[PDB]
Design a protein around this ligand. Structure first.
Ligand SMILES: Nc1ncnc2c1ncn2[C@@H]1O[C@H](COP(=O)(O)CP(=O)(O)OP(=O)(O)O)[C@@H](O)[C@H]1O
Ligand SMILES: [Ca+2]
Ligand SMILES: [Cl-]
Length: 468
């Protein structure tokens, strides 16, 4: 009797699982919202620098009319290489934020020390991918890596059709601080990661005025075999592809149809992505250099580390945000904890979602979210950045692990606006001029120099309908 090789495993549930980390795929959590889980782990924050200047130059006559196709192609060529490293070293890719990426090695606290060594070896192989090459003749893109280790909380929130997850706490806060301390080609360890790490293994140099450290080299001791050490660590790696599946990057590639799991997994993914997954739309439809309006909402709390206090507030804000956006086909692209505060990256005019008077609605929507979230229990400050223009929209990452992302100077601009002008709604010149709303709805703001943005142009507070 023949035993033919089981065919390519390409079910909708497998395609859905590409968009989600193992934290969610194999999560099986309560029905309730908010949901909170606590554990420990080791985080990697990989930032790519250069790619919004790339988005600008790919949004030029140069690339004829294939700017976004050429852009996602070269972006995914480098990002698939990093995703491969992280996966092969046992990491779970939690989230893509443009050309930036957060990874988790979730592990029992006694294994944190050993797992930090694994995550360092990984960090240095990632850097070593970008020691060689370059694009636009010479060099423009390298990576900065921040590492943290300790307590981690996960928050799951949403309603009957949508779900979003966040990771929270001091190791989350630390991994961001560690990353923006780094220069190109650096691996920065958070203080508690350096405190929990195997110091016989790792040569470091001190960071000026910062308690964090900078990794120089792995100097393993004489009886060290990394492959044997790695194998030892895999005992602690729940979902690490092994046995008949050692040839796979993700155990999630072996997921079988399960209606109840698929039902819960699809709530994390946009309906335009599911449409593609269902072969009801062309696979290239979703890669676009497209005019959009970014609404970046940031919520500050007295204590951004306590999921128990803040999770209800995030849930309540989500419930209001989701109903304000629905009206105008606005989307919550991502939610994430960003150097203080819970941030909602909201997008007006995604593919097939282009409402008329996008700018007036983006502004009215912002004020609405501003006023609601200001009266929610335990939200200290609400800040909203509004920016409009040509951004790259597309599926970013690896075949086995990818998400829909927005990339561009306008995304950086909205994000930086909500931080340099806290407690207000702000907008750029494109939104202000374009809305054509009367000039007294706006207040022109002082000029601030802002990180990761060259000329913002004139900026405005959206004051709203009344003088109040
Ligand atoms: N898709 C996205 N999701 C979440 N945050 C985003 C984002 N795109 C941009 N941002 C935010 O916007 C800011 C971008 O500024 P920086 O981090 O200074 C840019 P960079 O890493 O030097 O280079 P880049 O502009 O080439 O990406 C960050 O604070 C980041 O959180
Ligand atoms: Ca980045
Ligand atoms: Cl997150």
């Amino acid at each position: 009797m023949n035993t033919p090789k089981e065919e390519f495993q390409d079910w909708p549930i497998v395609r859905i699982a590409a968009h989600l980390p193992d934290l969610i795929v194999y999560g099986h959590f309560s029905p309730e919202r908010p949901f909170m889980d606590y554990f420990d782990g080791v985080l990697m924050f990989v930032d790519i620098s250069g790619f919004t200047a790339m988005t600008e130059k790919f949004s030029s006559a140069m690339y004829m009319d294939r700017g976004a196709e050429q852009l996602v192609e070269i972006l995914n060529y480098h990002i698939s290489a990093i995703v491969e490293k992280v996966l092969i070293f046992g990491g779970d890719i939690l989230k893509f934020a443009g050309d930036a990426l957060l990874a988790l090695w979730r592990v029992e606290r006694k294994q944190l020390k050993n797992i930090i060594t694994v995550v360092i070896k990984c960090s240095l192989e990632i850097h070593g991918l970008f020691e060689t090459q370059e694009w636009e003749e010479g060099l423009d893109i390298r990576v900065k890596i921040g590492l943290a280790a300790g307590h981690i909380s996960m928050l799951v929130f949403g309603d009957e059709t949508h779900s979003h997850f966040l990771v929270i706490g001091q190791a989350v806060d630390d991994v961001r601080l560690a990353q923006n301390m780094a220069q190109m080609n650096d691996v920065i360890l958070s203080p508690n990661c350096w405190q929990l790490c195997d110091r016989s293994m790792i040569e470091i140099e001190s960071v000026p005025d910062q308690r964090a450290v900078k990794v120089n080299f792995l100097k393993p001791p004489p009886n060290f075999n990394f492959d044997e050490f790695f194998t030892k660590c895999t005992t602690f790696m729940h979902y690490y592809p092994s046995g008949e599946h050692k040839n796979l990057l993700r155990l999630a590639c072996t997921l079988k149809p399960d209606p109840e799991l698929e039902m819960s997994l699809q709530k994390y993914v946009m309906e335009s992505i599911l449409k593609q997954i269902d072969n009801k739309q062309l696979q290239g439809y979703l890669s676009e250099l497209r005019p959009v309006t970014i609404v970046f909402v940031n919520l500050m709390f007295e204590d951004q580390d306590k999921a128990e206090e803040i999770g209800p507030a995030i849930q309540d804000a989500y419930m209001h945000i989701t109903s304000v956006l629905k009206i105008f086909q606005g989307q919550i692209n991502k939610v994430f904890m960003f150097d203080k505060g819970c941030s909602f990256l909201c997008v007006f005019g995604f593919p097939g979602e282009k409402v008329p008077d996008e700018l007036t609605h983006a502004l009215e929507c912002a004020m609405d979210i501003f006023d609601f979230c200001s009266q929610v229990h335990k939200i200290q400050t609400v800040s909203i950045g509004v920016a409009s223009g040509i951004v790259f929209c597309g599926i970013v990452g690896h075949t086995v692990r990818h998400e829909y992302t927005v990339i561009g100077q306008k995304v950086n601009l909205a994000a930086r606006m909500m931080m340099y002008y806290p407690g207000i709604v702000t907008c750029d010149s494109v939104t202000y001029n374009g809305s054509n709303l009367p000039a007294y709805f706006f207040k022109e703001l002082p000029k601030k120099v802002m990180k990761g943005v060259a000329d913002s142009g004139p900026l405005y507070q959206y004051w709203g309908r009344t003088e109040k």
